[model samples]
Target: AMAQNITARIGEPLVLKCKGAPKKPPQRLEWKLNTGRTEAWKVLSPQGGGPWDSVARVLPNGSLFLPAVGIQDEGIFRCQAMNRNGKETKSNYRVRVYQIP
Candidate 1:
């Protein structure tokens, strides 16, 4: 469990961390976004690993970045990494955002 903080000034650059094992090549993988805490999730895999602007954008170094930060952009993000290796890990985090009034 990585307790990463987006500790950034409002409207500035923000980077949070959600790290899990990345899938190896040739393995079918998909990234899903759970919209508003429901079972409903949007498949954001860029057409099955195609070019897509993913909110589930996990970097090669197992680092997650949320470029811009906003007040409404606060929530618990869950990322599950799975592949043909049969070994998988999920990274979950609670993110908090503060605005300077």
Candidate 2:
């Protein structure tokens, strides 16, 4: 009932799909990145709060994309889907960035 740990090379493209959201469709969605100490959350729809078309993007479907990932991009990613009734569902991911050497 959890996402497997993901490993990717630095500077490679990566996509993190949102899982475990509500099956009834969502009224709003959000994505977050946690680095053990700090957590940053972003709204994915209805006026999403984030950089415009940055290297990292949180998709409408709650998926996250990194056109070219870096070591700094390594973190725990999470997704939140909210229902019209204010109920919420969530998913989590553990990502690691590896150097080519």
Candidate 3:
């Protein structure tokens, strides 16, 4: 598992991809978030049965899209993929945000 760092400006579109996910069928992709609180991990993939988010969405290709990211969007995000063959791939992201006055 490798960790990636992403920086985004306030109100800008951001895309986070599952770098090593399988392209074929019989695979499941999910996006999860760690909000740096006691709430623990929250699923961000609506297609994967997770709750829908207003600013964040999971694309069909298993990428996380933030139409306009904010300071609240800063946190740890993870993408996990599992295939029928029981192979699992994971990617970690540390998201940071900056705002201009």
Candidate 4:
């Protein structure tokens, strides 16, 4: 599957992507932020990670919003779609951070 990447500026509003699909349709989509897991080769697994409330859930259009975007918000994101078939596809997004001034 095609991965997504975003370019965002500090203090700016960025539109993130929450995309990908399961062989079967999922009841809901989960978007996660990859923070401090880059050291290991396989950093982001469904292991000990906590919930990320910063993610703005979206509609069928697959659009998500990040208001007042900041530096801490920079990094990679992974979106998962799951259902009775369990997790199917994982679409990753690398978001680049910039400064307005």
Better of 1 and 3 by lDDT: 3
How much is the lDDT of residue 32 in candidate 2? 60
Query: What's the CA RMSD for each of the models?
Result: 5.0, 3.6, 3.7, 6.3
Residue-pair clashes per prediction, in order, are: 0, 0, 0, 0
**Candidate 1: 10-residue stretch with minimal lDDT:** 38-47
- Tens-place lDDT digits, model 2, residues 1-101: 46559888888998866654555554566556677554344446655556524757766665668788776666776666666677656566777788732
lDDT of 4 by residue, 1-101 (tens): 44466687877776755556534434554455565644211222223333332333344556666566676666676666656667545667776678622
Error of 2 at 4 (Å): 2.9
- Native-to-model Cα distance after best TM-score fit, residue 35 in candidate 4, in Å: 1.9
In the predicted model 4, the residue pairs found to clash are: none
Give the C-alpha miss distance for residue 72 in model 1, angstroms.
3.5
* TM-score between model 4 and native: 0.59
lDDT of each: 0.47, 0.65, 0.62, 0.55
Which candidate leads in lDDT? Answer: 2
Candidate 4 root-mean-square deviation in Å = 6.3
Tell me the TM-score of model 3.
0.66
Residues 1-99, candidate 1, lDDT per residue (tens digit)? Answer: 453443544445556554554444533333443335433233433234433344335465555555565544455456555566665455545554576
Cα deviation of 29, candidate 1, in Å: 4.3
Best by TM-score: 2
For 1-101, candidate 3 gives per-residue lDDT tens digits of 46578778877888866665545554455556666651324454334553345556666665667778766677777656556777655656777778633
The true-versus-predicted C-alpha distance at residue 38 of model 3, in Å, is 7.3
